[PDB]
């Protein structure tokens, strides 16, 4: 569905706006060296320039969303990124030979530093065909992104892969299709390798059956791993209209659905979807802001923009969660 696929333009605008202002990279929390901090920005900057080459319409959407970002959104984007990153880094530091499967990867570039930083990491990006065709175009067209992946400019990979360049694979898959998904995994992952699964604003676009099948099945495919999921929740307090508001706004604006926003309207209900994993941690992004963000970062963020409305931040961030499931 082309509607769902374009929710990536929102995710990308947000990523890009946070880098522009200077929220990211956070070299401390993302564990970026001097050169990788520089590259982080340079890679995202080229990604936007190269997107422009491939799609005027895409670029215009991304561009206007960036210009109109507000501090509360940049804090959210920062929290989302460092929170996932912190979960990933802890596991990769502890587990040398690891595979990362990034489900609904959109324009995510976290592989670029991760692959450098962790010599024995293998990483697999998975999104709809149309989305991964565009990502493959940008990655190969841009000289700096090609170099970062050791890629050639001529797409030289065999279906099911658009990129199959050593420790990185970019592959198309409809994740509503469990058989296509498990088939795809059989040829790019191994059962016995500690596996991190990332679903960052992916499951929110899925019907409960499809998302629960995908959760169960993927967890069953690997002896051990960690699922890191980030998503909104509709919110459980009485008279909390966040979910209601969000669903209505997406249906009127984009014809877009978030089928289980109200079903998983709190962190505990959300986390319960990984009840097969022995170790489930769940926090809303406000809790992350208070628990994981050092005072040095809080001070560095204040230097960049005026967050005049901290309570507005808190309200939004209590409606996003980071779930960590380990088996
Ligand atoms: N059924 C499905 N199969 C594969 N990709 C899907 C999918 N449903 C949604 N997606 C992908 O999920 C992404 C959500 S936008 C999130 C992008 C990225 N994970 C980030 O946080 O920046 C879009 O790229 C969309 O195409």
Swiss-Prot record:
Keyword terms: Methyltransferase, S-adenosyl-L-methionine, Transferase
- Provide the GO biological process annotations: methylation; protein-containing complex assembly; regulation of autophagy
Q: Which residues bind S-adenosyl-L-methionine?
A: 80, 104, 127, 174-176, 200
Q: Which Pfam families match?
A: LCM
Q: Which domain of life is it from?
A: Eukaryota
List the SUPFAM superfamilies: S-adenosyl-L-methionine-dependent methyltransferases
Known catalysed reaction(s)? [phosphatase 2A protein]-C-terminal L-leucine + S-adenosyl-L-methionine = [phosphatase 2A protein]-C-terminal L-leucine methyl ester + S-adenosyl-L-homocysteine
Q: What is its EC number?
A: 2.1.1.233
Q: Which GO terms describe its molecular function?
A: protein C-terminal leucine carboxyl O-methyltransferase activity
Query: Is Methyltransferase included in the keywords of this UniProt record?
Result: yes
Q: InterPro entries, per this entry?
A: LCMT1 (IPR016651), Ppm1/Ppm2/Tcmp (IPR007213), SAM-dependent_MTases_sf (IPR029063)
Q: Summarize what activates or inhibits it.
A: Inhibited by S-adenosyl-L-homocysteine.
The family note in this entry says: Belongs to the methyltransferase superfamily. LCMT family.
Q: What does this protein do?
A: Methylates the carboxyl group of the C-terminal leucine residue of protein phosphatase 2A catalytic subunits to form alpha-leucine ester residues. Acts on the two major protein phosphatase 2A catalytic subunits, PPH21 and PPH22.
Task: Please report the name of this protein according to its UniProt entry.
Answer: Leucine carboxyl methyltransferase 1
Q: Which organism is it from?
A: Saccharomyces cerevisiae (strain ATCC 204508 / S288c)
Q: What is the lineage of its organism?
A: Eukaryota, Fungi, Dikarya, Ascomycota, Saccharomycotina
UniProt gene name = PPM1
């Amino acid at each position: 569905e082309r509607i769902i696929q374009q929710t990536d333009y929102d995710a990308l605008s947000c990523k890009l706006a946070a880098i522009s202002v200077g929220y990211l990279p956070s070299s401390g929390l993302q564990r970026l060296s001097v050169d990788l901090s520089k590259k982080y920005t340079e890679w995202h900057r080229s990604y936007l320039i190269t997107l422009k080459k491939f799609s005027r319409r895409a670029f215009g959407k991304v561009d206007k969303a960036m210009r109109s970002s507000f501090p509360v959104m940049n804090y959210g984007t920062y929290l989302r990124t460092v929170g996932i990153d912190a979960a990933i880094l802890e596991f990769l530091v502890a587990n040398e030979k690891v595979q990362v499967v990034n489900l609904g990867c959109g324009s995510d570039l976290r592989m670029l530093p991760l692959l450098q930083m962790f010599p024995h990491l293998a990483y697999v990006d998975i999104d709809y065909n149309e989305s991964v065709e565009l990502k493959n175009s940008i990655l190969r067209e841009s000289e700096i992104l090609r170099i970062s992946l050791g890629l050639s400019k001529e797409d030289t990979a065999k279906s099911p892969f658009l990129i199959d360049q050593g420790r990185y694979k970019l592959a198309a898959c409809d994740l509503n299709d469990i058989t296509e998904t498990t088939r795809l995994l059989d040829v790019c992952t191994k059962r016995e390798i500690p596996t991190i699964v990332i679903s960052e604003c992916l499951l929110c676009y899925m019907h409960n059956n499809e998302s629960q099948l995908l959760i169960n099945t993927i967890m069953s495919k690997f002896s051990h791993g960690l699922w890191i999921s980030y998503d909104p929740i509709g919110g459980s307090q009485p008279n909390d209209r966040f979910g209601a508001i969000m669903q209505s706004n997406l249906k009127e604006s984009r014809n877009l659905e978030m089928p289980t926003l109200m079903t998983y309207n709190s962190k505990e209900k959300y986390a319960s979807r990984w009840s097969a994993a022995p170790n489930v941690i769940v926090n809303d992004m406000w809790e992350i802001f208070n628990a994981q963000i050092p005072e040095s970062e809080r001070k560095r963020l204040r230097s960049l923009q005026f967050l005049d409305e901290l309570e507005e931040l808190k309200v939004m961030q209590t409606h996003y969660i980071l779930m960590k499931a380990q088996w």
